[PDB]
Amino acid sequence: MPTLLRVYIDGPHGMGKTTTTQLLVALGSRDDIVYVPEPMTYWRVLGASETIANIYTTQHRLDQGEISAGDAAVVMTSAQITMGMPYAVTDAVLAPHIGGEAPPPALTLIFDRHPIAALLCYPAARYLMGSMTPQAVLAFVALIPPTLPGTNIVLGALPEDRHIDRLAKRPGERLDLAMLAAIRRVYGLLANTVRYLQCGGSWREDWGQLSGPQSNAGPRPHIGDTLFTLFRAPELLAPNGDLYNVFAWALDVLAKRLRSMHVFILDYDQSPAGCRDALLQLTSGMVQTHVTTPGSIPTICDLARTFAREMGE
Amino acid sequence: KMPTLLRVYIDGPHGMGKTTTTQLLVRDDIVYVPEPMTYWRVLGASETIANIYTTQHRLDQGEISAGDAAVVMTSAQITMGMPYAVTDAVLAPHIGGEAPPPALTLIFDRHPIAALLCYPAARYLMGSMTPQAVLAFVALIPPTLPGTNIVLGALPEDRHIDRLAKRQRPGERLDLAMLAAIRRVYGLLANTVRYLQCGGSWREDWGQLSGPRPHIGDTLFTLFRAPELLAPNGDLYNVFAWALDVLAKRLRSMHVFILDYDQSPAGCRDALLQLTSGMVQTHVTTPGSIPTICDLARTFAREMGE
Ligand SMILES: C#Cc1cn([C@@H]2O[C@H](CO)[C@@H](O)[C@@H]2F)c(=O)[nH]c1=O
Ligand SMILES: C#Cc1cn([C@@H]2O[C@H](CO)[C@@H](O)[C@@H]2F)c(=O)[nH]c1=O
């Protein structure tokens, strides 16, 4: 069978993810590699009207005390649903074509973000910003699609000071450093969570230890430095002080989805050509998969180009 | 060979009798997974059912916009579906291939598609959810595992009105339009499964909407000839067409069984038992899967059942 390499570039906004992705794709001959962009057109038009603008405006009205947490939550939850839809459909239509983990790839697919960005990371950050309930975050977690083989996720490293400057320059967006801190924190926790699970970590065994860096290598993190720490909140706790079982089961799903992921860390604290070449070096250690039919390769190619055409800027 | 499992999802429009009939149907090699009322009223959010019906009522009276109602309905639907989604996700790895004596029978009050497809679709028909949000929920419907037996109800409308009148849940308001919308959706659901199983292809038949199996106009696909979903030239945007491809994938491998509710509670129970002989069983994946499934089921029941 021919092989496929899927690479999801993810992490907080404003790091240079999208530029880096385009540069890497520009290296390949036209169809040895395809780009799957942020579905900006879906967010701004097809899915709803100006969803990004809606998100930042809602947070700002919450902060200013012009709306309640509950009103902010229903708007945020509904908008996060819209944000994630194209990621969910894409994953769903790709799924049957993906075979077992497997000599250059017949096809390389570079994604701008994985489904977990809209289904986990952004909701979790909004929870920290007080604009989503943790119960709602856990409903999104429960709906994270089964993690396909050869799911290579590239997350970003970048000093906060540089990141802030970068954001202050390079939508419907408003400048919110608090949200930036939360989303940086959330993606840091995510990297640690995958590494914790790969090192044999069991959240149920470590839950009692709760009371309040790079990845795919290094020692096992403390549970308090993983995403599990966010979910010890009064809303989720039964009178006896344990998590309600329904929420505990959502954490089980979280562990199952993240544990089979292949995380790599890319240093964004450099020029665009630098990030590209750094990303190119990283791909050597990334996991390829087989496809399930011979004509899966052109089918996948067409899906990606159709998607890009319809929804990328 | 691993022991066998029978999963039975009792679904369909609410207020037909689904929660009493199965209450009767139970007691060791059979577990009843009741509707997660406690999650709906307390754990997930405060009185989600009241929230839903109040919002539709306010929209009807023109006290809020279509827009305000949709964001409210959308997030509320997220809360409604959550226990159904976690349960499916934690059960999924335990489910083996198709497979006689079942080691364990799981009777669920509703399948994930109630909250991820049918109720959202009905609210779309009620003007209180956008069709793009409906297709977002559809895109997240978990893959259809082997042995997915879904029981849907049959009941004439007037009899259903009578039943519903006595089966109002906390916060529910009696709404004949919602009753009609939800009955229509489940009727379309049954048709859609049959359309798909008999080889229907929505992309091939899509042209027929704009003028041996059901006509596409009598399936769930007809709902998504919504103008929000269409480019200026009338074509579905691909992203929406893909959600329809997913909808088709999910439904065609479901096994649908019809339970006539127009009879006594014990008659309904007997009818459900009669239906089981056609249902498809699966093996589990590990020896300990059965006890684990049993624990999940009983814990769900205890913590979230009313
Ligand atoms: C995917 C994604 C998401 C992107 N975003 C935002 O979209 C913008 C562009 O990525 C940026 O301001 C931020 F990343 C969300 O607020 N939520 C999401 O789920
Ligand atoms: C599952 C489920 C759902 C149930 N409901 C409602 O909850 C009650 C189910 O017993 C009933 O009033 C109605 F069916 C929804 O409004 N949406 C759903 O998704």
XYZ file of C-alpha atoms and ligand atoms in Angstrom:
657
model
C 0.000 0.000 0.000
C 1.006 3.652 -0.445
C 1.546 5.572 2.785
C 0.148 8.810 4.140
C 1.629 11.391 6.478
C -0.830 13.596 8.374
C 0.523 16.549 10.323
C -1.643 18.815 12.454
C -0.067 22.162 13.301
C -1.772 23.417 16.478
C -1.458 25.645 19.534
C -2.441 29.171 20.597
C -3.320 31.697 17.906
C -0.739 34.303 16.927
C 2.363 32.076 16.866
C 2.891 31.799 13.114
C 1.244 28.415 12.674
C -0.555 29.331 9.467
C 2.458 30.926 7.791
C 4.646 27.938 8.680
C 2.167 25.511 7.221
C 1.966 27.394 3.908
C 5.750 27.596 3.656
C 6.208 23.857 4.203
C 3.618 23.062 1.539
C 5.313 25.470 -0.856
C 8.416 23.256 -0.734
C 6.718 20.149 -2.047
C 5.902 19.631 -5.679
C 2.246 20.563 -6.123
C 0.612 17.255 -5.154
C 3.069 15.362 -2.969
C 1.661 17.541 -0.185
C -1.691 19.225 0.488
C -2.732 22.070 2.788
C -5.878 21.971 4.919
C -6.390 25.556 6.204
C -8.420 27.084 9.009
C -11.966 27.166 7.667
C -12.206 30.977 7.961
C -15.020 31.135 5.419
C -17.057 28.717 7.532
C -16.413 30.700 10.700
C -17.205 34.056 9.067
C -20.014 33.178 6.663
C -21.187 29.611 5.988
C -21.459 28.348 9.545
C -22.737 31.543 11.113
C -22.041 35.257 10.810
C -18.619 36.461 12.044
C -18.133 33.772 14.729
C -14.665 34.988 15.736
C -16.015 38.521 16.225
C -18.892 37.045 18.202
C -16.499 35.161 20.516
C -14.296 38.118 21.369
C -17.220 40.537 21.722
C -18.978 38.168 24.130
C -15.882 37.790 26.339
C -15.477 41.558 26.379
C -19.093 42.124 27.411
C -18.650 39.536 30.165
C -15.465 41.233 31.389
C -17.212 44.610 31.363
C -20.110 43.178 33.389
C -22.642 43.976 30.668
C -23.799 40.345 30.473
C -23.989 37.443 32.923
C -21.793 34.327 33.008
C -24.771 32.230 31.913
C -25.510 34.403 28.885
C -21.832 34.416 27.981
C -21.715 30.646 28.337
C -24.625 29.890 25.990
C -23.162 32.194 23.339
C -19.647 30.772 23.791
C -20.790 27.138 23.747
C -22.880 27.608 20.615
C -20.041 29.492 18.876
C -17.531 26.781 19.790
C -19.818 24.229 18.167
C -19.689 26.294 14.960
C -15.907 26.711 15.166
C -15.345 22.966 15.295
C -17.780 21.676 12.701
C -15.462 21.617 9.658
C -12.787 19.845 11.709
C -15.259 17.193 12.797
C -16.605 16.525 9.286
C -13.134 16.415 7.779
C -11.947 13.890 10.366
C -15.099 11.826 9.831
C -14.713 11.618 6.047
C -10.983 10.955 6.290
C -11.386 8.167 8.872
C -12.344 5.224 6.606
C -9.346 5.929 4.363
C -6.844 5.670 7.208
C -5.121 2.344 7.835
C -2.625 1.036 10.363
C 0.595 2.761 11.361
C 3.312 1.969 8.837
C 10.208 5.393 2.605
C 8.666 8.713 1.442
C 4.893 9.290 1.882
C 2.831 9.001 -1.279
C 0.898 11.923 0.235
C 1.484 14.411 3.037
C -1.447 16.316 4.531
C -0.700 19.385 6.617
C -3.591 20.533 8.806
C -4.016 23.943 10.311
C -5.178 22.673 13.743
C -6.542 19.340 14.949
C -10.196 18.736 16.004
C -9.099 19.002 19.694
C -8.467 22.729 19.269
C -12.181 23.515 18.951
C -13.401 20.474 20.887
C -11.060 20.729 23.887
C -8.484 23.494 23.998
C -10.517 26.602 23.242
C -13.461 25.494 25.400
C -11.097 24.725 28.281
C -9.514 28.187 27.900
C -12.951 29.838 27.840
C -13.811 27.970 31.015
C -10.740 29.546 32.638
C -11.923 32.942 31.301
C -15.279 32.315 32.985
C -17.317 32.164 29.769
C -17.998 28.434 29.661
C -19.032 25.882 32.281
C -16.734 22.927 32.910
C -19.706 20.614 32.318
C -19.937 22.013 28.813
C -16.201 21.613 28.264
C -16.630 17.956 29.254
C -19.522 17.504 26.795
C -17.151 18.654 24.025
C -14.500 16.231 25.323
C -16.993 13.386 25.184
C -17.553 14.152 21.492
C -13.885 14.196 20.465
C -13.697 11.716 17.551
C -11.736 8.488 17.990
C -8.058 9.275 17.506
C -6.901 8.039 14.112
C -3.575 6.185 13.736
C -0.595 8.388 12.855
C -2.022 11.498 14.460
C 1.028 13.755 14.539
C 0.364 16.957 16.454
C 2.868 19.790 16.345
C 2.473 22.260 19.179
C 4.292 25.567 19.535
C 6.906 26.955 21.908
C 7.317 30.727 22.166
C 8.201 33.076 25.034
C 5.131 34.917 26.310
C 6.777 38.306 25.792
C 7.459 37.621 22.117
C 4.037 35.992 21.740
C 2.331 39.091 23.179
C 4.248 41.456 20.837
C 3.445 39.170 17.918
C -0.240 39.183 18.843
C -0.279 42.972 19.414
C 0.738 43.330 15.756
C 0.264 40.263 13.540
C -10.610 39.157 12.152
C -13.181 40.412 14.632
C -10.493 39.796 17.225
C -9.852 41.951 20.263
C -6.537 42.008 22.096
C -6.963 39.887 25.187
C -3.780 38.897 27.011
C -5.812 37.042 29.644
C -7.235 34.730 26.978
C -3.701 34.439 25.571
C -2.405 33.297 28.947
C -5.245 30.775 29.265
C -4.783 29.303 25.796
C -0.998 29.099 26.245
C -1.570 27.419 29.629
C -4.108 24.992 28.138
C -1.801 23.886 25.293
C 1.079 23.507 27.737
C -1.158 21.262 29.868
C -2.114 19.335 26.736
C 1.510 18.512 25.811
C 2.114 17.359 29.354
C -1.116 15.299 29.291
C -0.059 13.250 26.282
C 3.379 12.719 27.823
C 1.833 11.758 31.177
C -0.358 9.138 29.491
C 2.461 7.782 27.353
C 4.519 7.304 30.513
C 1.776 5.090 31.955
C -0.010 7.769 33.988
C -3.430 6.870 35.336
C -5.527 9.869 36.306
C -7.802 7.836 38.585
C -4.767 6.603 40.548
C -3.367 10.139 40.808
C -6.572 12.146 41.344
C -5.871 12.490 45.057
C -2.617 14.302 44.291
C -4.568 17.299 42.990
C -4.976 20.374 45.225
C -4.893 23.874 43.721
C 7.800 22.382 28.451
C 8.538 20.154 25.411
C 7.039 16.672 24.807
C 7.033 13.081 23.448
C 10.151 12.855 25.644
C 11.261 13.516 29.223
C 9.909 12.138 32.520
C 6.286 11.691 33.639
C 4.673 15.018 34.616
C 2.717 15.515 37.829
C -1.057 15.207 37.246
C -1.356 18.826 38.409
C 0.545 19.838 35.267
C -1.906 18.070 32.941
C -5.424 18.903 31.736
C -6.906 16.709 34.476
C -6.159 19.444 36.996
C -8.725 21.797 35.392
C -11.596 19.475 36.245
C -11.420 19.546 40.010
C -14.114 22.197 40.262
C -17.068 22.344 42.673
C -19.618 21.938 39.860
C -18.227 18.520 39.021
C -17.842 17.212 42.590
C -20.367 15.066 44.465
C -21.098 15.630 48.207
C -18.587 12.899 49.084
C -15.961 15.036 47.341
C -15.313 12.750 44.366
C -16.131 13.521 40.762
C -19.563 12.447 39.633
C -19.132 9.304 37.574
C -20.465 10.984 34.437
C -17.600 13.490 34.565
C -15.031 10.844 35.509
C -16.062 8.958 32.385
C -15.445 12.064 30.289
C -11.926 12.169 31.742
C -11.494 8.513 30.753
C -12.409 9.494 27.189
C -9.943 12.360 27.341
C -7.181 9.924 28.377
C -8.116 7.490 25.608
C -8.063 10.183 22.890
C -4.799 11.897 23.896
C -2.725 8.857 24.766
C -2.290 7.563 21.236
C -1.275 10.952 19.835
C 2.252 11.749 18.661
C 3.241 15.182 19.939
C 6.163 17.253 18.631
C 7.168 20.732 19.753
C 8.166 23.402 17.252
C 10.112 26.510 18.279
C 8.293 29.513 16.842
C 10.830 31.963 18.248
C 12.504 32.417 14.855
C 11.961 33.652 11.306
C 9.261 32.152 9.057
C 11.868 30.306 6.950
C 13.385 29.085 10.223
C 10.070 27.672 11.480
C 9.566 25.961 8.124
C 12.951 24.235 8.111
C 12.584 23.327 11.774
C 9.198 21.784 10.968
C 10.687 19.982 7.986
C 13.337 18.387 10.225
C 10.658 17.277 12.701
C 8.714 15.360 10.051
C 11.447 12.724 9.814
C 10.361 11.341 13.187
C 6.646 11.495 12.431
C 4.370 8.485 12.080
C 2.924 7.493 8.721
C -0.017 5.185 8.123
C -1.248 2.983 5.308
C -4.424 3.852 3.472
C -7.207 1.302 3.186
C -7.777 1.440 -0.586
C -5.411 2.164 -3.469
C -7.511 5.082 -4.721
C -7.559 6.581 -1.222
C -4.620 8.834 -2.097
C -6.290 10.814 -4.893
C -9.614 10.795 -2.988
C -7.886 12.317 0.059
C -6.130 14.817 -2.189
C -9.426 15.930 -3.706
C -11.085 16.236 -0.261
C -8.271 18.468 0.976
C -8.244 20.708 -2.098
C -12.044 20.958 -2.154
C -11.981 21.897 1.545
C -9.193 24.455 1.049
C -10.897 26.035 -1.965
C -14.232 26.360 -0.197
C -13.133 27.424 3.277
C -9.633 28.872 3.367
C -9.208 32.646 2.976
C -15.010 -16.727 21.754
C -15.990 -13.885 24.087
C -19.425 -13.685 25.707
C -22.197 -11.997 23.723
C -23.926 -8.668 24.289
C -27.303 -7.347 23.161
C -27.695 -3.554 23.115
C -31.227 -2.226 22.814
C -31.899 1.491 22.433
C -35.481 2.518 23.139
C -35.957 5.731 21.257
C -38.488 7.791 19.317
C -40.671 10.779 20.173
C -41.107 11.397 23.884
C -44.483 10.904 25.525
C -45.396 7.645 23.799
C -44.655 5.478 26.838
C -40.942 4.576 26.460
C -39.939 4.951 30.135
C -42.736 2.887 31.721
C -42.671 0.043 29.172
C -38.958 -0.616 29.785
C -39.320 -0.002 33.519
C -41.549 -3.075 33.394
C -39.009 -4.970 31.268
C -36.805 -5.468 34.333
C -32.713 -8.805 36.587
C -29.046 -9.849 36.547
C -28.239 -10.451 32.896
C -30.235 -7.376 31.939
C -29.630 -3.756 32.878
C -31.878 -0.783 32.257
C -30.107 2.507 31.555
C -32.756 5.139 32.306
C -32.965 8.685 31.014
C -30.352 10.845 32.719
C -32.918 13.210 34.279
C -30.645 14.137 37.176
C -27.930 15.272 34.768
C -30.552 17.326 32.898
C -31.976 18.988 36.022
C -28.927 19.388 38.287
C -25.497 17.974 37.337
C -24.970 19.286 33.814
C -26.955 22.470 34.238
C -30.034 23.749 36.073
C -33.365 22.424 34.738
C -32.335 22.026 31.108
C -35.774 20.778 30.124
C -37.529 23.876 31.510
C -34.873 25.988 29.799
C -35.638 24.377 26.454
C -39.444 24.676 26.530
C -39.358 28.177 28.024
C -37.062 29.389 25.251
C -39.282 27.970 22.506
C -42.313 29.510 24.237
C -40.636 32.915 24.378
C -39.708 32.637 20.689
C -43.293 31.751 19.810
C -44.609 34.794 21.700
C -42.009 36.931 19.947
C -40.314 37.800 23.231
C -36.873 36.829 21.843
C -35.327 36.569 18.359
C -34.784 33.436 16.296
C -31.103 34.180 16.912
C -31.237 34.333 20.714
C -33.327 31.180 20.758
C -30.871 29.224 18.583
C -27.806 29.831 20.751
C -29.834 28.856 23.790
C -31.237 25.720 22.138
C -27.829 24.754 20.801
C -26.035 24.838 24.147
C -28.995 23.229 25.894
C -28.881 20.358 23.395
C -25.206 19.932 24.218
C -26.144 19.371 27.871
C -28.971 16.980 26.966
C -26.717 14.749 24.884
C -23.649 14.618 27.148
C -24.441 11.472 29.195
C -25.374 9.696 25.955
C -22.097 10.686 24.367
C -19.814 9.681 27.274
C -21.598 6.378 27.646
C -21.138 5.519 24.001
C -17.469 6.534 24.097
C -16.659 4.418 27.173
C -18.671 1.469 25.878
C -17.221 1.544 22.352
C -13.887 -0.306 22.941
C -15.792 -3.106 24.693
C -17.870 -3.845 21.592
C -16.738 -6.683 19.352
C -17.987 -7.949 16.012
C -21.417 -9.393 15.294
C -22.162 -12.830 16.702
C -28.354 -18.015 20.883
C -27.968 -16.898 24.553
C -26.880 -13.308 25.328
C -24.615 -13.062 28.368
C -25.930 -9.530 28.952
C -28.701 -7.296 27.646
C -28.424 -3.529 27.869
C -31.644 -1.573 27.487
C -30.968 2.121 26.978
C -33.550 4.848 27.255
C -32.593 6.531 23.955
C -29.609 6.466 21.637
C -27.117 9.333 21.081
C -28.880 10.259 17.820
C -31.884 11.540 19.783
C -29.838 14.436 21.167
C -27.354 14.650 18.292
C -29.784 14.509 15.377
C -33.520 14.150 16.016
C -34.181 16.788 18.677
C -31.899 19.339 16.966
C -33.652 18.626 13.639
C -37.086 19.104 15.225
C -36.011 22.391 16.793
C -34.751 23.433 13.371
C -38.311 22.761 12.171
C -39.517 24.844 15.165
C -37.407 27.789 14.026
C -35.218 27.593 17.153
C -32.011 26.057 15.745
C -29.981 26.859 12.626
C -29.485 24.008 10.176
C -25.681 24.535 10.378
C -25.803 23.684 14.104
C -27.825 20.586 13.301
C -25.102 19.457 10.906
C -22.445 20.209 13.522
C -24.203 17.752 15.852
C -24.496 15.262 13.001
C -20.762 15.547 12.279
C -20.086 14.466 15.878
C -22.368 11.395 15.894
C -20.117 8.571 17.079
C -19.341 5.824 14.544
C -22.058 3.172 14.436
C -20.806 0.095 16.247
C -21.985 -3.425 15.423
C -25.274 -4.513 16.991
C -26.836 -1.064 17.193
C -30.536 -1.945 17.582
C -32.789 1.086 17.855
C -36.467 0.716 18.775
C -38.709 3.460 17.473
C -42.385 3.866 18.342
C -45.606 3.844 16.376
C -48.648 5.622 17.851
C -51.462 7.561 16.132
C -51.166 11.272 16.839
C -54.284 11.757 18.973
C -53.399 8.819 21.209
C -49.888 10.270 21.458
C -51.348 13.617 22.522
C -53.263 11.781 25.285
C -50.149 9.911 26.446
C -47.978 13.021 26.293
C -50.484 14.970 28.393
C -49.883 12.512 31.246
C -46.117 12.183 30.684
C -44.942 15.807 30.957
C -41.449 15.997 32.438
C -40.353 18.674 34.898
C -40.280 21.992 33.072
C -41.907 20.561 29.965
C -44.705 22.519 28.263
C -47.334 20.757 26.164
C -46.524 21.779 22.618
C -48.428 20.177 19.732
C -46.175 21.841 17.171
C -43.069 20.327 18.793
C -44.993 17.047 19.005
C -45.650 17.270 15.276
C -42.070 18.287 14.476
C -40.528 15.463 16.537
C -42.967 12.851 15.170
C -42.090 14.000 11.645
C -38.353 13.772 12.328
C -38.553 10.208 13.697
C -40.814 9.240 10.790
C -38.179 10.650 8.432
C -35.500 8.775 10.415
C -37.157 5.413 9.861
C -37.525 6.235 6.153
C -33.903 7.351 5.886
C -32.530 4.100 7.325
C -34.658 2.112 4.866
C -33.698 4.404 1.957
C -30.007 3.917 2.776
C -30.226 0.167 3.375
C -32.001 -0.373 0.049
C -29.081 1.344 -1.692
C -30.322 4.923 -1.861
C -27.658 7.488 -2.710
C -28.457 11.015 -1.572
C -26.036 12.680 -4.019
C -27.597 10.778 -6.924
C -31.148 11.654 -5.819
C -30.481 15.207 -4.619
C -31.793 16.633 -7.886
C -35.195 15.103 -7.150
C -35.823 17.462 -4.213
C -36.087 20.512 -6.478
C -39.251 20.260 -8.587
C -37.608 0.222 -4.346
C -37.163 2.571 -1.440
C -38.651 5.785 -0.087
C -38.396 8.941 -2.201
C -35.592 11.184 -0.936
C -38.262 13.805 -0.225
C -39.523 11.538 2.521
C -36.122 11.185 4.199
C -34.084 13.310 6.577
C -32.149 14.626 3.582
C -35.073 16.812 2.548
C -34.558 18.910 5.694
C -31.107 19.938 4.505
C -32.318 21.545 1.323
C -32.191 24.621 3.570
C -31.074 27.891 1.934
C -28.498 28.591 4.649
C -26.666 25.511 3.350
C -26.652 26.464 -0.317
C -24.306 28.449 -2.561
C -25.751 31.196 -4.845
C -26.062 28.634 -7.657
C -28.109 26.291 -5.517
C -25.457 23.650 -4.755
C -24.811 22.404 -1.235
C -21.563 23.687 0.154
C -19.174 20.733 0.300
C -18.718 21.021 4.030
C -22.481 20.449 4.438
C -22.512 17.701 1.796
C -19.809 15.945 3.803
C -21.990 16.059 6.930
C -24.711 14.403 4.859
C -22.186 11.720 3.786
C -21.509 11.189 7.489
C -25.240 11.110 8.280
C -25.619 8.422 5.598
C -22.698 6.364 6.959
C -24.050 6.440 10.520
C -27.691 5.540 9.799
C -27.342 2.828 7.180
C -25.758 0.341 9.581
C -28.315 0.912 12.331
C -30.917 -1.768 12.934
C -34.377 -0.255 13.356
C -37.325 -1.998 15.027
C -40.832 -0.605 15.377
C -42.749 -0.908 18.637
C -46.487 -0.261 18.516
C -47.265 1.788 21.619
C -51.047 1.803 21.028
C -51.648 -0.908 23.606
C -51.339 -1.607 27.354
C -48.018 -1.118 29.224
C -47.560 -4.875 29.652
C -48.476 -5.352 26.008
C -45.734 -2.875 25.099
C -43.321 -4.831 27.285
C -44.260 -8.090 25.623
C -43.943 -6.512 22.202
C -40.450 -5.296 23.069
C -39.459 -8.825 24.155
C -40.872 -10.185 20.889
C -38.739 -7.707 18.939
C -35.513 -8.930 20.542
C -35.345 -12.118 18.483
C -34.455 -10.090 15.400
C -31.909 -7.890 17.127
C -28.241 -8.377 16.438
C -25.816 -9.330 19.176
C -22.115 -8.720 19.377
C -19.212 -10.300 21.185
C -17.378 -8.197 23.730
C -13.639 -7.561 23.359
C -12.299 -8.812 26.735
C -13.374 -11.377 29.338
C -13.924 -8.616 31.880
C -15.987 -6.493 29.469
C -19.317 -7.886 30.710
C -18.818 -7.061 34.418
C -17.424 -3.640 33.425
C -20.391 -2.887 31.173
C -22.730 -3.989 33.947
C -21.019 -1.621 36.376
C -21.172 1.335 33.978
C -24.844 0.680 33.337
C -25.844 0.400 36.999
C -23.726 3.385 38.058
C -25.314 5.533 35.312
C -28.760 4.395 36.475
C -28.046 5.164 40.130
C -26.407 8.543 39.670
C -28.499 10.014 36.868
C -31.842 8.193 36.784
C -34.854 9.927 38.365
C -10.095 25.770 15.977
C -10.326 26.790 16.571
C -10.632 27.969 17.306
C -10.123 29.183 17.031
N -10.435 30.303 17.782
C -9.896 31.618 17.444
O -9.898 31.740 16.011
C -8.950 32.764 15.656
C -8.090 32.255 14.490
O -7.553 30.973 14.801
C -8.178 33.114 16.926
O -8.591 34.373 17.420
C -8.482 31.972 17.881
F -7.660 30.924 17.616
C -11.326 30.249 18.846
O -11.647 31.221 19.535
N -11.850 29.006 19.106
C -11.581 27.850 18.422
O -12.084 26.763 18.702
C -32.169 12.650 24.405
C -32.829 13.648 24.422
C -33.586 14.855 24.411
C -34.711 15.023 25.116
N -35.445 16.196 25.093
C -36.638 16.345 25.924
O -36.370 15.705 27.195
C -37.519 14.913 27.542
C -37.175 13.452 27.266
O -37.849 12.662 28.224
C -38.673 15.439 26.689
O -39.297 16.547 27.302
C -37.983 15.829 25.397
F -37.828 14.720 24.621
C -35.050 17.292 24.339
O -35.659 18.361 24.286
N -33.893 17.109 23.615
C -33.116 15.977 23.581
O -32.093 15.888 22.898
